[PDB]
Amino acid sequence: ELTEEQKQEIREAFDLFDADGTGTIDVKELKVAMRALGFEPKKEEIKKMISEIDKEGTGKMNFGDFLTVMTQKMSEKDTKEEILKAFKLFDDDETGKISFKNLKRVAKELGENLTDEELQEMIDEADRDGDGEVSEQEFLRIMKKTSLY
Template identity: 55%
Template sequence: MFANSRIKRRSRASSPTATRLAAYPAARVEISEEQRQDIKEAFELFDSDKDHAIDYHELRAAMRALGFEAQKSEVLKIIRDFDKTGKGLLQMDDFIRVMSEKIAERDPLDEIKRAFELFDDDGTGKISLRNLRRVAKELNENIDDQELEAMIEEFDLDQDGEINEQEFIAIMMDDS
């Protein structure tokens, strides 16, 4: 009898569900409150029927909105690992758990470089006045050219009139 109970315990501990859930730690991952709010807002935005659960397509769109280009297999695995209803749905608390873990795993330097590319839409390797003007317009910010030029001048270490990737990284990593 004792031998049988050990076998049962071992099989439960190594069940497929336990193994899958172990990939997503239950402990609260260290992310900022702003990031946590972004995750929640993405979920709410893509929960089109407002049933507090999202399906495959909604999950993939929400992940993209948060900056993750997830492959079909990854999205399906997340749903398979967390689907509590058997209907192919992911609940909000599980979405927050998974996305918090993914955000915590991001390399900050990679994120900064990705942000630089958003500014450098013409692929010159530098952020020009024209690039800043476009971003300000996209964000509906009313900033005149004088202010934009002052921003460039403040951070343009090599004095070429534009912000290169290294200067951008220095700006973004400045803790002061």
């Protein structure tokens, strides 16, 4: 179970660039097709996904691969939305970062007995830019490499 009605939207998006009925669409038009269904990928992500879709250098993708890519993008988008909601749960003061105070408050509210030294160790371990805390992007990355979600 992935969807019932959104599959028709993906079919329409694929058929927008396949008016000739050749069964395949150009990979270079991948950015617009994602924007047709609401996705807003970045240049690095677009290049990475074009490299994976077009490993053989054909330049065209069939309906099955396009549908799978769209489903994966939807899954990643909802996962990112849930991670952002979790970040907002951590960031109750809307500071944009999960500071030491926010993590400590969340740990105390949840009843966890995690030491403050362990809290700052985890913050530093998930700190990439060295700002002293974890940002939205750092939290997203740490969730990506988490055990599971």
